């Protein structure tokens, strides 16, 4: 994240980070104890390590919970060949459940109607351990930023849109992370970070994947 500020311990307890061959290559969000939501382009098949309760990736704060991904469900309409950045959403099943607490807590997901209403509030939070500058290194401590909602026309100066929106910037490493709207002290997932490149930021509309999310993340 660029031009943001340092997150506070347990300020975004739904935030997770993805580790592969390199650390902090993408972000995600806790749907529930056993499920993560992220971007499809972040997830190749190779061994992914999800880390919850993460604040500073350099320090051992005794709040962290590492988990292996055993199942990856990219949205049925996602196709790396063709667009790559459309229907850009996936779900990760963890090997062992997360133990929920103050530092590890899921993000609320409303129905299709209210997710969109929350989006239209016009101000959401984005976060991650992406680059601090354009070509700078990945963030040590979790960054967050308030990004305003941009209208159709203004953004179109560059989108499949129906399932995407614009705001702002998010940078490389933030992809898959949450765009979140806070309503009366409770945070709801309103988008997934797709990309920024020039660190407006382009986002996936969560509203249009809610039912798919709820269905696939059913606990039994």
């Amino acid at each position: 994240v660029v031009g943001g500020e340092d997150a506070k311990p347990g300020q975004f307890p739904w935030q997770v980070v993805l580790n592969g061959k390199v650390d902090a290559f993408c972000g995600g969000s806790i749907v529930n104890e056993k499920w993560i939501v992220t971007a499809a382009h972040c997830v190749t098949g190779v061994k992914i390590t999800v880390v919850a309760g993460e604040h500073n990736i350099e320090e051992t704060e005794h709040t962290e919970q590492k988990r292996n991904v055993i199942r990856i469900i990219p949205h049925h309409n996602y196709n790396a060949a063709i667009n790559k950045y459309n229907h850009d959403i996936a779900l990760l099943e963890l090997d062992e459940p997360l133990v929920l607490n103050s530092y590890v807590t899921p993000i609320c997901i409303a129905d299709k109607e209210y997710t969109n209403i929350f989006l239209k509030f016009g101000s959401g939070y984005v976060s991650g351990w992406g680059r601090v500058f354009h070509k700078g290194r990945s963030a040590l401590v979790l960054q967050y930023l308030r990004v305003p909602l941009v209208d159709r026309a203004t953004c179109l100066r560059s989108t499949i849109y129906n399932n995407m929106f614009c705001a702002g910037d998010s940078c490389q490493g933030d992809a898959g992370g949450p765009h979140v709207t806070e309503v009366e002290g409770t945070s709801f997932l309103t988008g997934i970070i797709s990309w920024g490149e020039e660190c407006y930021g382009i986002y996936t509309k969560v509203s249009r994947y809610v039912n798919w999310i709820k269905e696939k993340t059913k606990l039994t």
Binding site: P9, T105, I107, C108, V183, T186, S187
Partner: protein, 52 residues
Amino acid sequence: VTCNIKNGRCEQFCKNSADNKVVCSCTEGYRLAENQKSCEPAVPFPCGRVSV
């Protein structure tokens, strides 16, 4: 009062009852509060809350 103004003063979700009255509602992990508007934890660690 109705849902189209101030979300019927409901903190999270609003729905119109069959007698021109608001029925406030909350998401999984929350319950409707005593004031019939606000949402409070129904489990130790409900979604989307900072606990620190």
